Design an enzyme around this catalytic site. Structure first.
Site, PDB file in Angstrom:
ATOM      1  NE  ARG A  73      36.571  77.618  42.316  1.00  0.00           N
ATOM      2  CZ  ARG A  73      36.915  76.458  41.672  1.00  0.00           C
ATOM      3  NH1 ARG A  73      36.105  76.703  40.522  1.00  0.00           N
ATOM      4  NH2 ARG A  73      37.719  75.703  41.930  1.00  0.00           N
ATOM      5  CE  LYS A 220      34.304  79.609  27.966  1.00  0.00           C
ATOM      6  NZ  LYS A 220      35.397  80.246  28.741  1.00  0.00           N
ATOM      7  CB  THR A 278      36.839  71.847  27.494  1.00  0.00           C
ATOM      8  OG1 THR A 278      35.660  70.868  27.224  1.00  0.00           O
ATOM      9  CG2 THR A 278      36.227  73.328  28.040  1.00  0.00           C
TER      10      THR A 278
END
Lengths: 470, 470, 467, 467
Positions: A73, A220, A278
């Site tokens: 990030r 995931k 999601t």
């Protein structure tokens, strides 16, 4: 009743015993704890509240711990203010976490940023809102040319499609969270940002070090690297979570729906649970009903063959959690109703030809005799998951003495687990299975049931199929 | 190349010859004129611009005129200001169009409002944002109780699920627009808010009165009444447009995706074109790329078997029309690539057992000989549409002397129409079809082609299949 | 090893213990006793000799008693001399058994001859060599017109095709022979000249009354009436013997091969044993090898799906009995080798058929050389055999009668066991005996079929084991 | 109406025009001339008589010339008397054709007898009645040990199974007979004792050299060598005649029925005509009806898929020729009636097979009673027949030789037409002739198959029409 299972992320509005009881009534099967937020006291209290409701009502549910995981990030900007980036400009990333960014440069959280990248690679910021291309790498700086206009804020996600990122599987916080999971006896761990098989192995070794060897790992798949290594990830995992929204940031938009269909199909063939997650009913965070588009997307994931669908913010922090679960269960029931069995062999492991031949045969026999119920005897859950692979019309009543297996089977499509004291012989299994078939209310006097088990073999093989009238 | 066809709604940003040429390059097959807006001069100029581009480039395209249609809407409020409606309050509709509304009452455009409704019916306002229940009907007023809180603005749509609405098929403006369509020689008419078969018949009789007997009628299914009468509507129509978003206002949200799949399947079985429309890539009105959800929804409509997909605002008034067509064509090509033939007979009309037996056989033979091309001779287009029903891997090259048929076949999945001077015999058809197969570049020396036609029968039957090496 | 079973008629040349042992080595599975001839002492001694050999060697076999039955025949001629009958002549049959016949009249053995016939019916004499038509019936005489020339001898067969004959199912001799069958504990009774369902019921009641309720009845289809009533005869029977030669006398010759194929297919579908008999290897009564035609006829009956083939005079009185059994076994093995399973699917038996069909399908998908069945009455073994499995059927039973009767079923190897106390015990024992049988080896897959928590008559469980 | 075709050997009792007309009415399709006997005048007169009947009645038939061929036989014995051979004795064959034989030695007709044999080979005499083993070969003598007792007569067949015999394909007589076939314009030549591919090529070259290139060669498989080389013989031939009786002398008897089934299936797959011959209805040489066994044997050859069945002595010299053809036609019709299509699928002929298979499938889905084919050389008609259509095949051709040759193909009705100028003209004419044939009526569906814009040898078009 529906067959597709519902995972609900639990938060402040849905953590009470009263709310959890209503969530289960509405169709919740599995509680997801998102360890991206909350401390051990909150999560421990949520676990205890669900187990109290389970004990009081006799309903069964599973607990899934979802790791925060590791990502790249951007960091802080001057005065916390957005800066406007212009296509064709120069823009620089630095690994020096102390640097405060502006319209020309910003810091990133990943020190390997300069190592893993190369001139010509594409860098994506804020869910792919702004694209850039690396033009030079010098010391702790990655120099880029901006491709499209965009506004940069603080702490935005960075994505590197076509690059392998050397990020460790687990941060220090993830390791402590996994230890907490083992102490609490959670049924599943869902691992964020799984990129390669070594990531799964390193989670497996952590759980085995803290008495969690019987905990199922759900990898995931959230990025291009995980998708490229899907086959090795699946082989090392106990199941998969398809995180469509995250995946769509890094791969061509026309590929996302085929990535989902491919991953679901391979999970079914491997007899391993798959969760679709999601962008399911996100609009219901604010609205008491979902959109046409959302309902269609969910139904198509079920027709693809998903074991389970997952609510995130809709159940964790949204304004209409019970409405979200109710409509999700309604979509599940409506869609499951029109699905057919898939009686193709699809057997790729020669070591399991017997199990697959017997389980496939048992579903074919159930369908030809209009059996509403297949009763399976299972220790680890394999026999129940082997039957489910063929999408039987019949409900699967899975009898086990293993509490962990009973919980984990709650996530498998169309499986109703039942904990039993013991099963001492094949004939005793038939006696008990017929009694419990009637007690379950899933079948009545005169119905045919097909009963599946392992006789004179150890756990992990299913070799016997038997037809009984109740 | 893609097989699924693209309908593009043309507006001010996309009406120029230059833009239309780029739209065709990007994958546009059919121009939609939405007569909800624009005058005869604008629409006439759009028709002329496309025909100029077609003449200059030799590309082919079809023109579809879309009627405004008839609906119920609320009218004006005091000072044009929104009013907040509270669940449990009384609220009244009146048919007196002169009344200015407020928090207690509003006028509607439909005089039959009091006739078609009954105590206990549910009234929906503004795409179902506000629900009400009729509590009384007296003179020109329908008295209701409000069910949910909502803000009412001016000129909002009214929906009456579970009620038949006695609205005429065509308003006066629709009748003049249809006459304009016949004068312009449009290929298709798409009729909004088709509710029952008599609506289709009344459009057919209007077109036959103005030389439009050869114009194909596409019925738009937009509400619960049209869906309930789907079978009779299809039988009377030449094709169907599935308007998912409008339909989702009136039927349970979990039913919408099954209504779409059912309608598409019945159109395929009837050898009638189907268009999937609304909420396709709407986000691209403002954004240069679509969402993951939008791309998935479009791809699933193609996997359902739609002949065509339609752009509305994305191409008519949006900021990224060429980007929208390009990505739509990319989704089409990616999805078409993985679809298989459907070689089941699916023959329900005994009068067409010969046509279906020969066309199905021809696709099966094409697939077993790896023929990249099926060449069909057709007058009205039936033989090409009969081949397309089985979703051949091969491209369909449709030879015709009928200009109208050549245009209309542009909307059928995987059909490449070619206008020819004449075909005097079956053997002459084989000679010409082999030449044009090579000229088309869709097949090369040594390729097998399967050639389909009617021999010693009139138009409307296909009875001959022939295998040739180029 | 062959799957098709061999029925051998035992006579003077093949009744010794030494000969019986060699017959079994050559492929004999079932001994037929033809009660058309021989007294109780001879048949009892053949039974004793076979059971001695079975005890000494541990080989298994079944015993089938074949009844004489009742037929219509002409009787004596003056001076024992043949008479020449001329087409178009008058010729009379009489029921008066004392009349000595000539070129104009002859007696018949059946007193109902005048009752059952009518003006216009067809009478056939001597395997259909002479045809006649009834022109009148008066008192004890049936007056006829001869249709074709022929010579009439003494004691010739009479056939009335398209007429129902009111002959009892069992003559008095047949009833005594069946009592003998019960005394001896035979495994099968084959009933000659079965004409209708009531015939089978009369035999069933007669056996039940003499302790033979566990004896299987094989109805012999030998004439037009039996063939017309086939469906009801099969339903009442435990099995069928297709007697092609006799049937060829009464129905059109082009129909005989389809009557055989139809009856075999219906027996398979009913899970009931079927024997193909007569005109099998008859040339080997005199010759040490059969004809091309005989070998092909036998092989086609096997390809039709017969459980068993039958030797008559070839084994009973012929000069080359061992040669006949050996070549028959060679034909069986050569033909069985190339046959495939038939995996195509009574509401009361949907479960049994679903499990047994599935078991054969699973056996073939896993290349299992052996299907082990647990059976009390033999039903489960016969239900698996219906699908013509490639695998051998090892049928475990505690019922001695069942163990013997399963010897006649195609591809079934019966084994008598002390007991089977549970489903898991059945798997333990079946794997041991699979290995002991030599029909399967370490690492082979076997499919094991049984009834769990149900009574006899239903098969509900299939289980796959590695040896 | 039957589909299986009947080959009748014509002899003195069946050569008259009156008899030939009745043979055709009874179901004869093809006349066989057996050149083992008769001179050119007799065979020429039979050809002339049949062609007169065909011209007078408009019935069609084919003519097949069957060669004598070459074999090994023993020769004369002293005083013409049989000699008894004792098992274990010495016995010598000599190639010296002047030697008169006895219990110790006999001459044979084949000079290569000493060349082709080796110590240890097996010699069979008189349809395998006497077996011997070669113990030595010296000069013109093959010295043997006798294996089984038997009586040797004069002029008996000799068989050397498992040995290749260097006998020429054609004797000088066969070459002259083939020239006669070419002079007469026969439709088929059946070549006796084909042993290998070179034999077929020699016949093909001989016919080509005498204007017979359009004559179809039917290779007769009669011995072990021919069967071993079957695949190459079929590839070089236009068809096969399965001579079961002769083959039964040289191979194990249990193999004969599988050799027949294998050869028929391969002929079907190759789209080449197959005749089943020998031991068909032989009993009817003397009897007015056949045996049960004969009827079943014939029916099973039809169910195997034979195009045609063949009468030998039954029609040539027997006492009941018309009865034999009538019952044979009855068996054909009864058996053809219950057979189903076989719709299962050379890269050079993938198109022809795809179209013809599709055409039969479409015919059956639409209940078409008729498939009309356009054909020059007969390939398209034979390609449709391969799938055993329920529908009759009406084969339109301008080739007279083809029209006659298609008479032998199962279920094919050939019709000679003046011309076919286009695909649309073929549809026009085929619908007219479909109606005129009486095989289809107003409202029936017909499927029409042809080659469009391709030369002979490929079938590429299928078209569905309502009459």
């Amino acid at each position: 009743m529906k067959k597709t299972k519902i995972v609900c992320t639990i938060g402040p509005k849905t953590e009470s015993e009263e709310m959890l009881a209503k969530m289960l009534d509405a169709g919740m099967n599995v509680m997801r704890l998102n360890f991206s937020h909350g401390d051990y006291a909150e999560h421990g209290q949520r676990i205890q509240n669900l187990r109290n409701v389970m004990s009081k009502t006799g309903k069964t549910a599973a607990i899934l711990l979802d790791t925060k995981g590791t990502e790249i990030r951007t960091m802080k900007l001057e005065g916390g203010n957005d800066v406007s980036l212009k296509a064709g400009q120069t823009f620089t990333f630095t690994t020096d976490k102390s640097v405060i960014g502006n319209s020309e440069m910003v810091a990133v959280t990943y020190e390997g940023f300069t190592t893993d990248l190369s001139v010509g690679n594409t860098v994506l910021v804020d869910d792919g809102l702004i694209g850039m291309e690396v033009t030079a790498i010098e010391g702790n700086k990655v120099i880029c040319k901006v491709l499209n206009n965009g506004d940069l804020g603080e702490n935005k996600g960075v994505n590197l499609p076509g690059v392998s990122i050397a990020l460790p599987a687990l941060a220090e916080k993830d390791k402590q969270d996994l230890i907490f999971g083992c102490e609490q006896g959670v049924d599943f761990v869902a691992a964020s940002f799984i990129r390669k098989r070594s990531d799964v192995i390193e989670i497996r070794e952590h759980l085995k070090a803290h008495g969690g060897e019987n905990i199922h790992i759900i990898s995931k798949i959230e990025n291009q690297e995980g998708l490229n290594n899907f086959d090795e990830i699946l082989e090392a995992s106990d199941g998969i979570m398809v995180a469509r929204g995250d995946l769509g940031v890094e791969i061509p938009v026309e590929e996302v729906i085929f990535a989902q269909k491919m991953m679901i199909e391979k999970c079914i063939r491997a007899r391993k649970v798959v969760i679709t997650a999601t962008q399911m009913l996100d609009s219901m965070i604010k609205n008491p009903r979902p959109t046409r588009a959302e309902a269609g997307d969910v139904a198509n994931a079920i027709l693809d063959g998903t074991d389970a669908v997952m609510l995130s913010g809709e159940s964790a922090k949204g304004k209409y959690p019970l409405e979200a679960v109710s409509i999700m269960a309604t979509i599940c029931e409506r869609t499951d109703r029109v699905m057919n069995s898939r009686l193709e062999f699809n057997n790729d492991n020669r070591k399991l030809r017997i199990t697959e031949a017997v389980c496939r045969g048992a579903v074919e026999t159930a369908e030809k005799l209009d059996a509403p119920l297949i009763v399976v005897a299972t220790q680890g859950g394999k026999s129940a998951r082997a039957v489910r692979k063929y999408f039987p019309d019949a409900t699967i009543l899975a009898l086990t003495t293993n509490e962990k297996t009973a919980h984990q089977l709650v996530l498998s499509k169309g499986v109703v687990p039942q904990l039993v004291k013991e099963i001492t012989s094949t004939d005793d299994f038939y006696r008990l299975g017929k009694e419990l078939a009637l007690q379950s209310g899933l079948a009545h006097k005169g119905d045919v049931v097909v009963m599946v088990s392992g006789a004179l073999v150890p756990s992990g093989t299913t070799n016997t199929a038997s037809v009984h009238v109740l």
